[PDB]
Design a protein around this ligand. Structure first.
Ligand SMILES: [Cl-]
Ligand SMILES: [Cl-]
Ligand SMILES: [Cl-]
Ligand SMILES: [Cl-]
Ligand SMILES: [Cl-]
Ligand SMILES: [Cl-]
Ligand SMILES: [Cl-]
Ligand SMILES: [Cl-]
Ligand SMILES: [Mg+2]
Ligand SMILES: [Mg+2]
Lengths: 270, 270, 270, 270
């Protein structure tokens, strides 16, 4: 596979270590991943965006190379960390590129917390409620029953769940990039924890304020998304992007794997 | 793959349909499968045994093509069904070939119910208490939590669980033979039902009476079985087979897939 | 996989039908593939370039969906066809995006035939002599022996040869896209024919004239190319691009499959 | 996969080392493989035949672990070696189990050289003229073009050719067992060498003498054999086996991989 992004740095967020890294120089561009993934979703994207921007990426608290504490790692926490990183990085009016729960996080940070962006690219965002597959919804009710699974059975569930996000099946090498953080004893608990902490109110609170903002918004949408119906993406575009949707054929929820070129084009050909 | 066995007959067992079939002519030989499989474990074995025997095979109540009722399908039921079928078939002193819970069933039918056999070939039988893999032991405590899973997640767990039974991974075609009965709504509930009903007492009651029986016994034992430790196979051989164990290297629990030739040899090369 | 590009049009070139298609509106951009592939190498690239350009793509004579005649299909012919299509399409100073033998063809058309471009993006071009893989050099000496192979053996060789062009193995569905044109009786003969017609002089004639052209030029280079050494890519960049290569890590010859996002970035982030 | 047979011994055949091994004790049983394979075709069969026989197996000159000389390795040589081994092993009237060119060899040794057997089991033997797949016939006419292939192309050809012998595709681990001897520089030359040395006369000379022998003959025939038409198997059965075939459904030429249990049953169930 293509190389993993180097998240060399550690930011202390309220006693938790947050992994982050940067590439390139120029105007700031911040990349925000979703669940159950990590900044590695940008490994074929960030290097091309870094030719003309200083690109920032970090792993959400509870994900990837960041700490996975027995603590609040929900969307109620992630926009606080997002704002804290922008201040740590001393950046103003960043370009923002965000996927899934990362999209929820930057929509909360703008509409609830007032953070100004220079422009915003969303990729299959979780943005209007209710949201959540039946698996997420069922697992959230039996957390201890799933965290206690034998390692191989957990391995199989994580592998299948990640597989639902793509229209083209991943190679095992690539699937491993996203699965591996969840396979340690801490990671297995962390996987079901962030599912169990999901709550509709985090998205509903942001959605109540949606309106076209004072910066351009574009929404890249994998048409074959098994998790969110296409018409929900169009409804979001109607609400904040003047009805504009960048539809990506033969791509599922994880457009970064099915069609990273689509995201590169959307950001660079703006 | 090889042809599936035709189980074209239906026997009424206390109001439940039991699928069964036969091949060949000659002395009777009855094949008994275990969990979570079906008579299809004999599809590469029964045709060769049928050259000189009238071979009978049936699907346990709750498995395969037999009915999957919300009722007792435990080992406490299966020996009753086994004896009822021997009566229905009007067979006396069959040769017996049995695997896993099929082995427990024919051991109970002989040592508890007094049924005489011509000879007995066991393949990785569940015969010594306690028995239960980590997945079965864990899932037994969370039945509704697992039956409630979305189809693709249950699909993932069943595929992985079946995979633990073999040393050489199955092709998808062959895995599908064993997985498919558990994927309908009734099959999904039935899969977790037969796990929830497992009890050590069904094995313990037979084990308390173990001794060399009044017919030849041999035990074919896949050495790499992930579900039953070799020590219990050695114990069974010491208790009922005068220390004789046919160890099969590089074969897991499901010897019928890793090394069906070993079972054909054990039965035919007396 | 992603949709195949629709090449619904046919151009009559000296009695041979040439397949081609177009997407988008605006300034013209022409895409030129290489061997042994087709315009399908642009199926994840052309749609994004078509957002702001009218994209044209065609299959080289002897390739893809174009006719596969028992005639000259070498690079000596392809620049004549390229110029004929530009005239047919009535396009002036197109942007050009070209790979492998497509690069050789557009370099010949500019440096030998004087055709003007407004911009040139080359991807792992065949441009510096000598060029040719071990398979090509061997098979060029035994055309009849390989054409005479039974279908499944030719199938295996074409599959293996195509696989040498990528760093990440293709799915069988994607490999089929590129292999299928070569599997008919006519396609099997055409595959070895275009190998046997290769000659270094077609490259050498163009190379003698290389200098920085009067339009911008950039070279995308998959670093792990098994068919062209990096040093020849650098030599070309030294001659026509002021020493600049856009290096693509973990990408082989067929950057379109290993890293299509790199090509999209190189064209659009100009 | 199941472990490889240990051919621990070496026999001097006319200045060439021949690999051979034995398992078990009791009456002799000699196993003879065919092309392009080795004694490893018996790795799941020989251990079960050894429970009551002393089983002998060796690799044909030119194959497997035996020497691969630039010398005659054809069927014209192999019956000489077979007779020399029987004499070296001091065995008389052995049971014989032979496949493919191994069948041709033991048929030639009996009907042309007069060696008496006590029992003969043939598996998809080469025995009736003419015999030879289009791949074999074409490669035999262009030997130098194929031996000079790049290693990866030879690897793909050998893999595909072996794949034609099975109805169920091999795992790569198992395919490796059969492919590996042909991948060294010496093995690559040796692979095309034994194809190029094939001649119909070796079969025709034996076929002219076929008649029911003074020992039992059984013919195991994989019904899906792509290399030898079923009609030639029935023709052989009519001439030396009283018209009897042991048909094996859903098995190809290499019955040892598709259905080793069928060969075990055929030898032992008597
Ligand atoms: Cl902090
Ligand atoms: Cl909620
Ligand atoms: Cl219990
Ligand atoms: Cl694709
Ligand atoms: Cl013309
Ligand atoms: Cl030349
Ligand atoms: Cl190998
Ligand atoms: Cl000949
Ligand atoms: Mg288990
Ligand atoms: Mg022992």
């Amino acid at each position: 596979h293509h190389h993993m992004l180097d998240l060399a740095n550690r930011f202390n967020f309220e006693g938790h270590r947050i992994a982050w890294g940067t590439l390139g120089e120029g105007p700031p561009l911040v990349l925000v991943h979703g669940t159950p993934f990590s900044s590695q979703v940008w490994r074929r994207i960030a290097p091309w965006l870094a030719r003309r921007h200083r690109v920032f990426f970090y792993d959400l608290l509870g994900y990837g190379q960041s700490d996975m504490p027995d603590a609040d790692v929900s969307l109620g926490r992630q926009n606080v960390l997002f704002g804290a990183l922008l201040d740590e990085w001393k950046i103003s009016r960043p370009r923002v590129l965000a996927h899934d729960y990362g999209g929820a996080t930057v929509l909360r940070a703008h509409f609830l917390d007032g953070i100004a962006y220079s422009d915003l690219t969303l990729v299959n965002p979780v943005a209007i409620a209710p949201q959540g597959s039946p698996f997420v919804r069922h697992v959230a009710q039996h957390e201890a029953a799933f965290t206690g699974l034998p390692a191989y059975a957990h391995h199989a569930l994580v592998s299948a769940y990640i597989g639902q996000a793509v229209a083209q099946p991943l190679s095992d090498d690539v699937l491993s990039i996203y699965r591996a953080p969840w396979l340690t004893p801490a990671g297995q608990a962390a996987f079901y924890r962030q599912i169990a902490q999901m709550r509709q109110r985090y998205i509903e609170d942001a959605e109540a304020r949606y309106a076209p903002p004072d910066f351009p918004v574009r929404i890249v949408w994998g048409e074959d998304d098994r998790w969110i119906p296409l018409e929900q993406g169009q409804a979001l575009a109607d609400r904040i992007a003047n009805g504009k949707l960048i539809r990506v054929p033969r791509a599922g929820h994880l457009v970064q794997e099915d069609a990273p070129e689509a995201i590169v084009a959307a950001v660079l050909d703006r």
